[PDB]
Amino acid sequence: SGFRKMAFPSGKVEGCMVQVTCGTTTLNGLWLDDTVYCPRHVICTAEDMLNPNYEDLLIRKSNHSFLVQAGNVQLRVIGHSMQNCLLRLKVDTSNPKTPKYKFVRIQPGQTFSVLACYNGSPSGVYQCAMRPNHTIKGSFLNGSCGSVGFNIDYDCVSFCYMHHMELPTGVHAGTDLEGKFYGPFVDRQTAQAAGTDTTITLNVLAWLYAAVINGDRWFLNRFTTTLNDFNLVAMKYNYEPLTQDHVDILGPLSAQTGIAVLDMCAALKELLQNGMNGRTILGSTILEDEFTPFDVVRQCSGVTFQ
């Protein structure tokens, strides 16, 4: 037993990280087959980060403007294109370590692992959720751009995030691997602020199931709720409204614990209203919202500690 924020093993992603340099700007890139992906802001001039015109900046570059390094090996750039907010650099060598991979756009509430990288060298790995306001609560310093987020299914890597910026609340913004931003953000240093966030109701509920699977029932109650009555309380506490789809997603967890979803919702409504009374749930004093139902099924025993 136990319950931890668990990241995917990062080795298949480590073998894909390189360093990309244009002038005196260096950041991370992702090398799959004969292509290296990286934030287009690598081509920004030091005094024009406010209003860069990337089409105009990019046409002024050649293939040899870009320096790509994999460990100690220089990879020769032989073609380049811009795709939304990324660059695609074609190189002379196909990555021998390219895993099976897909590019996916993840959805708010879903989680992924981040491989924080600096100068093309991986330094750490942690799990993040895509927030409802399309930011992540990551941990990134200068040099971290081009670090990627991913999930692994069987032996296929689903890349879903490349890192681009930090906003003033200390939260993080970036794109999928087609270069489209998550959220309304743009890759320029003009003032921008994350919209107000919301708590991910489906995940809080999934995590309550985890706590039960793992043997704790203290927070349950004799009550039930309608979906609509629940959502009135949810709006009050800045929780996302719960939908029938969310209820259907909780099906398997519900089945495993013998707890109907709306009974679990009633339990959660009581927690919101009354607090936790100095008690913890899976070691936590707050209601945790960064584990999906998928994450709970992946980590917990298939057998409830009854």
Ligand X SMILES: *[C@@H](CC(=O)OCC)[C@H](C[C@@H]1CCNC1=O)NC(=O)[C@H](Cc1ccccc1)NC(=O)[C@H](CC(=O)OC(C)(C)C)NC(=O)OCc1ccccc1
Q: Which residues bind a second copy (CB under 8 A)?
A: 1-12, 14-15, 115-116, 122-126, 137-141, 166, 170-172, 214-215, 283-286, 298-299, 301
Return the CA Rg of the chain. 22
* C-alpha span between 22 and 42 (Å, rounded): 6
Which residues within the stretch 173-212 sit at the binding site for ligand X (CB under 6 A)?
187-192
Q: Give the position of tokens 């409204």.
A: 241
Q: Are 31 and 77 in contact (CB under 8 A)?
A: no
Does 142 participate in binding ligand X (rule CB under 6 A)? yes
Query: Quick one: which H or E segment has residue 213?
Result: helix 201-213
Shortest gap between Cβ of 79 and ligand X (angstroms)?
A: 23
Stretch that binds ligand X, among 62-70, 102-110, 141-149, 270-278 (CB under 6 A): 141-149
Q: Which of 6, 57, 167, 276 binds ligand X (CB under 6 A)?
A: 167
Shortest gap between Cβ of 302 and a second copy (angstroms)?
A: 9
Task: Clarify whether 145 is annotated catalytic.
Answer: yes
DSSP three-state, residue 75: strand
Nearer to ligand X, 44 or 160 (CB): 44
Give DSSP secondary structure letters for 40-73: GGGG--TT-SSS--HHHHHHT--GGGEEEEETTE
Q: Give the position of tokens 């100690």.
A: 72
DSSP three-state, residue 269: helix
Shortest gap between Cβ of 140 and a second copy (angstroms)?
A: 6
Among 203, 217, 262, 253, CA closest to 5: 203
Residue whose C-beta lies closest to ligand X: 145
* C-alpha span between 227 and 285 (Å, rounded): 26
Task: Clarify whether 246 is annotated catalytic.
Answer: no
Q: Which of 141, 244, 286, 302 binds ligand X (CB under 6 A)?
A: 141
Nearer to a second copy, 73 or 286 (CB): 286
Q: Which of 64, 72, 96, 168 binds ligand X (CB under 6 A)?
A: 168
Task: Determine if residue 169 is left, alpha or beta; phi over 0 gives left, psi from -120 to 50 gives alpha, anything else beta.
Answer: alpha
Active-site residue (options: 38, 41, 44, 160): 41
Q: Which of 31, 37, 140, 150 binds ligand X (CB under 6 A)?
A: 140
- Contacted entry of a second copy, ligand X, none for residue 251, CB cut-off 5 to 8 Å set by kind: none
Q: Looking at the annotation, which residues are catalytic?
A: 41, 145
